[PDB]
Amino acid sequence: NKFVTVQATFGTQVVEKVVLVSLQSGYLFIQTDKTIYTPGSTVLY
Amino acid sequence: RRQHARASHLGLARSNLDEDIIAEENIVSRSEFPESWLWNVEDLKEPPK
């Protein structure tokens, strides 16, 4: 769990808070024309 | 079945032999459907309204 500290200088005053960091990649959606095939037919996705 | 065919079957009856519905098990669902078509992609490029 990688952390980074966030420090803000409010004029003379300072407030600091440590927040967790992580990265997300994305999503994949797979679309198939049919769910039941037969030997010989073509699968399109 | 030999007893059944000896008792309830007659060669001169002139009445058709009784037929019984099979009423089986293990019934299999359909698995053959027409193949898919229209496998093409297009880009809309007309001036939007």
- Encoded tokens for A32: 């198939």
Resolution (A): 3.5
Q: Which residue from A36, A42, A44 is facing B31, i.e. has the nearest CB?
A: A36
Q: Does B39 touch chain A (CB under 8 A)?
A: yes
Burial annotation A3-39 (CB, 10 A radius, 16+ → b, else e): eeeeeeeeeeeeeeeeeeeeeeeeeeeeeeeeeeeee
Q: Which residue from B31, B36, B39 is facing A38, i.e. has the nearest CB?
A: B31
Please give the backbone phi and psi of residue A33, each rounded to the nearest 5 degrees, phi first: -65, -40
Which residues partner with A3 through β-bridges? A20
Among chain A residues, CA nearest to B32: A38
Q: Could B36 and A36 be called an inter-chain contact, meaning their C-beta atoms sit closer than 8 Å?
A: no
| Structural biology method used | cryo-EM
